[PDB]
Amino acid sequence: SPSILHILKEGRLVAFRDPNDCLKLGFVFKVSLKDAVCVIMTFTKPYKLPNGEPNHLIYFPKADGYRRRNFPKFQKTDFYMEEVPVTAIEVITKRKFAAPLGKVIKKDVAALNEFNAETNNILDGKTLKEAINIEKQGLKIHQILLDRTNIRDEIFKLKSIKCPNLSQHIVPKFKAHVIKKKIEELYHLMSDQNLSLLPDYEKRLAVLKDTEFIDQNHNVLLKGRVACEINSGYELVLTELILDNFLGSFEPEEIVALLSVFVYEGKTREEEPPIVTPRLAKGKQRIEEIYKKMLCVFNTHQIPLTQDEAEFLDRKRFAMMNVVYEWARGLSFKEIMEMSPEAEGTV
């Protein structure tokens, strides 16, 4: 931030608290920008209520009716250090002094008197202005601020606000809402929709509904029916291949060779030869187009495919058309072998 380390002032007033959970105040030693490890010098013990319980309300700036209700004063305590994260630090405020903590520790005359004065001045009266800067960038941060400062004034909007004593009566209510939805709601959610595969599955439904295989009411259509027969991984393009009379122009050999593109790895060093007939080339082109389209449609939803399916078009699968076509005619196994690049078992 533009005033995160040096400009804000060494020993600035912040409201931190350990797991005891009570309203406290202290001075910043040095805002460590790495592991969030601020060494805060407290001057107040955990402020328990008149009843004798942990106080849950935070300093909600600018309101006499809010804070003086339950926070007329706080407890006075002498200097001792504690390390704490930035998450525990609640609301930073202005009322501070420029002199360091070392001076306070080593018993000076200028530091200690002014110090004690500041310790009790805060107690006597306090209606401070909050100050966190948005001038660096603010995109997520700005949004968060917008969310919060609307909810800041929303605390006055609701019914409970001008009570005689709220935080004395809250310990039951707090206990209920917080602890009853701590690991009951959450445990339930740990056996309702556990993994991200169910959400991702629902995103796989978005593409399956868009491609018109299953209808929008989540039931199978003719496209989904025909596709139910195909057990191979490249089923959607293959399903799309059977629609129009495009296939009717081909001969059986041409069809079977065309179908070889799907059932072959296509990982090799050697070059692809020229295609055996223009119809096959056309078919190949069509297939390529369809797979591009499918890649596009998958890509809009943003779901990662397998290394095989990510590669597909880049891999050298298309040479086996020229291979199997000859076999489909009625040719010797040597002749075809001497055409093809790959090993014989693979073929």
Next chain:
Amino acid sequence: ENVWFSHPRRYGKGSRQCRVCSSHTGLIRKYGLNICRQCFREKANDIGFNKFR
């Protein structure tokens, strides 16, 4: 170990040096880069200062 093995080096040619070569004379402070001028020349096109004029 030794409380006598360090003169003041708060400023001057002795304080700051070329990060590549560690010379003292011929140091490019401009734009807070701190590179030995010869070293800078060597890695000039690498950093991306191209000779136009």
Next chain:
Amino acid sequence: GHVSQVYAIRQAIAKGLVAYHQKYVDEQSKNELKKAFTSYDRTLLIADSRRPEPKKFGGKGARSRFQKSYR
């Protein structure tokens, strides 16, 4: 500077006038104006096309160089 500024302002006065004539008066008047000016032309309408040549090393100025010794 001062002379330069003067030159600029006079030029502006000229161009502004002729342009004004061109838009909001007939052309013949503007032609008359031009011909009156362009005959005299001290960069009256058109700007001065000379512009500072840069300084180069081994000398205080552009074409000037430092003195050499031999002995």
Next chain:
Amino acid sequence: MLMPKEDRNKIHQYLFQEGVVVAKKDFNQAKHEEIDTKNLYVIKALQSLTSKGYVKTQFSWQYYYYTLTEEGVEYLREYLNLPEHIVPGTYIQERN
């Protein structure tokens, strides 16, 4: 170089738990980052380690790029006396 053995232990340990060590060439630095020791002490102990294999070095822009080996791992398990097939340097870890 002569130094307290605890510092050496810290060094050998941290290096084992990571695999890599870095150091700006500066004797008269005071504390070196991460490992709680002066920089000189680090640099010289690592040099000593390197001497007989175990860790490989690359100087590059005065920043000492130290990297652990296989024999080095064996040496460090021996020194730090911890079980094999359990605590290595940085082998597989990531899925890719």
Next chain:
Amino acid sequence: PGVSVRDVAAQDFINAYASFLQRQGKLEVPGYVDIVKTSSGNEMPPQDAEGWFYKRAASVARHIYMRKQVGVGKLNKLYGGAKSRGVRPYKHIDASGSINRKVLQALEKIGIVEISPKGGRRISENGQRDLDRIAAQTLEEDE
């Protein structure tokens, strides 16, 4: 060393005023004025002697007039002589700023200028209606 007199009556614009500022009986001299060099990079005091401060008053009146809003440091930069050290020709160097400050402090009192937002100082509507009007009345008289 100074600025913005090329245009109108350089000397006469700020001479009939100079005696008129004495005529007013409102001016407020420092006390240590008139035994002073006027700049660090200068050499002699002014040759007007019984005056000069009144010239610099209307010159600072003119300065506040000049534009928008003006300061102290700016005045120092302006009336500053530039300093001649040895060989070291005449590098532009600040004025006896104290004098300008004093002038400002005087003018504010007389009801001509006031301290503005954005810092600096600005001319008033009532201000110069009477001050330099009589001096430039010579130009209106001649016309």
Next chain:
Amino acid sequence: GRVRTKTVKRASKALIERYYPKLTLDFQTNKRLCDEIATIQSKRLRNKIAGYTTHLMKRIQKGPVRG
């Protein structure tokens, strides 16, 4: 001085040899015609080529040039 170089002259000549229909004896028209007719890298060079073609046409009209 203002002497035209090899790639301007030779290329111009080549153009006149295989495009005599078109290439009327005006500079500006040729200038765009050159951009259309063939790929040229820089603007300057193109312009030079156009100029030389114009010159050539101007001196083709008076008599049959050798080359």
Next chain:
Amino acid sequence: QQQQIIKIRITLTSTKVKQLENVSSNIVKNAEQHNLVKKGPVRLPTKVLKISTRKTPNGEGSKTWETYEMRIHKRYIDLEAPVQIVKRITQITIEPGVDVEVVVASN
């Protein structure tokens, strides 16, 4: 339930012109497509980082100098845009060399 406008200000800066202007034009296009008022593709004065140095490593030789200069081209673009389009336009348009920044809360 309007999806509220916040006045976004993008600040692209780079050492390249063609790689930068590409991203600029893309931003102009995408933002146009969504039908939003904006403050141009406003370009700034390009900053030249001039470094004068002697050619020779050591003093001997004719005193030859060498200018070494790096360009900085900078574009600021204000999209008077809703809270929706911030996340849509930030994720798109990334490039090695082109340093991209976005900022809001103009006052």
Next chain:
Amino acid sequence: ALISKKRKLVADGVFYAELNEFFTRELAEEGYSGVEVRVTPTKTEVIIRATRTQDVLGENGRRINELTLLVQKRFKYAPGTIVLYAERVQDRGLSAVAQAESMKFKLLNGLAIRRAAYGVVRYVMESGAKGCEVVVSGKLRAARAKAMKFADGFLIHS
């Protein structure tokens, strides 16, 4: 953050430089070609080019991990912000750096200069280049220095 654009770009340049030099030093055997500092939102990717990803990538991503550690521990980044990669350089050549490395290694094995130089030039020619120039300075054969200059095809100098 909060650094001037001027200062910033220079810093980036410096980072790029130090990277390239380090990679050149460490990735010597592999035939390192070049890198690119691919800055992104939040993450900072770094593509590395070489002839082979034999041990640059590593066994199950070990040497690459080490390299990443070196990078992020050196310049002090948050773990998993900076990321390295290993792309194949194209044509085993045309990139001069790789070729220079190949020369260097051919020599240090124990070979005559001619064989190296003409091997390199022929390879370049095969790789579909317009032309090549290989110059070797220093002490070849004799005690006094000499400059052998091999070339083929075509070049430019202006």
Next chain:
RNA sequence: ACGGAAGGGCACCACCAGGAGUGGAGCCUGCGGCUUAAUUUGACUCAACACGGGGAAACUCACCAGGUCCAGACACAAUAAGGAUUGACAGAUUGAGAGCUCUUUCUUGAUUUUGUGGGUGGUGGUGCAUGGCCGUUCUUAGUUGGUGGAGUGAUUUGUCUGCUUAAUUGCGAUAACGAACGAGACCUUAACCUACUAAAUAGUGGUGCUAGCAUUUGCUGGUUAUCCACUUCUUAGAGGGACUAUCGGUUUCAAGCCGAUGGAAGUUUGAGGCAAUAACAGGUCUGUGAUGCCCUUAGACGUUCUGGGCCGCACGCGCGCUACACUGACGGAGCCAGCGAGUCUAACCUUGGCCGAGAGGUCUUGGUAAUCUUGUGAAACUCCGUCGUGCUGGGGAUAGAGCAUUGUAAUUAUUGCUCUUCAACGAGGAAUUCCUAGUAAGCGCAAGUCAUCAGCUUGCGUUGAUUACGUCCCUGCCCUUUGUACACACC
């Protein structure tokens, strides 16, 4: 290759025509010598001498007088928990709360330790052992090999008799034919776009709120808020634009050249960047963890602390920037810019108000920057007054006395101011440097070194000339012919 041989062509690192100067304009720094405890050191015609980015108070530092520290990895013995080795308050000690060393004893716990091989570091040597880099030959048009031809061969031709070009550029000719590099082309930049894209981080105009001096409505801000309108200026992006364009002459009438017309731009439109082949035993091991061999390696030329020195000097030589005085210097009233640069894990650029003659101090503010510093309202010069020819008044050295700032530390004064000594100096022999247009010359300004210091450079503007627009005589360069007892090549 050279020639006080020929022919042709060239350059303000050559002249002519002049302009500005340098050997006394600031007195500076650099070198030589001299001096030296040291006064480190490289470079000596062009192509060493404000150069080493070298403006050094220490650190830089390498040199000198001294003092420590081990960062001697590793292996191999050997001493060795009845302790290897480390550290140690204080007395002595010494510039010195350096245990360095001793005195007294405590602490320490395999790390070291003394010895042997082997490393390591070195601003040590060698730039004539090298790499890289740079300079110069060489601000030049030159160099090559494929296949042909000639010659026993070295080699030659191509690469040329003319003509033209800044140019082996072309035009042509032709035992050569096509080709490649260099040149050109290319890149950046300098100028022109009242056309496109727009811009409160740039302007301008209109409407609510200002008209206070020359004002009735200069131009300015009141006006980050009053909303709207605009893109000429200002910024960029994309393009266009000049090609010697049209006309005339001139030439086998071809390449081209000279004038005129328009044109923002008509010397390759100016300026640069890039820049071939082969070289020099040019410079550099003091840029480099670039290195070979040599030298040294724990009273170490290693690293580090204390104090000097590199500033030892009226100069024996070299560069460098104000106004020798009335086209002047003052007192004021003077005076528009343009390159830039700028705080983070901190203290940079300073606006603002107060105090101070002053330099400065202070309380704060704006600024990670077309927004704030900062229209860097710079200087020379416009306007009146003061001298007016006088080593005087013109302007403020050399020496003294104080007050400020920066810095652990200013002493052989860092700088700055203030007063007293008063000096742009009597137009600089012989000699020699740069210079043809917004240049030369004047004048400041920023940046680079930087805590502080500029007269150093690197860029930037501002005012702005005279005199060629040529030649080969001097000094050199390129080609061709020729001569040669030269070839480390006319030294």
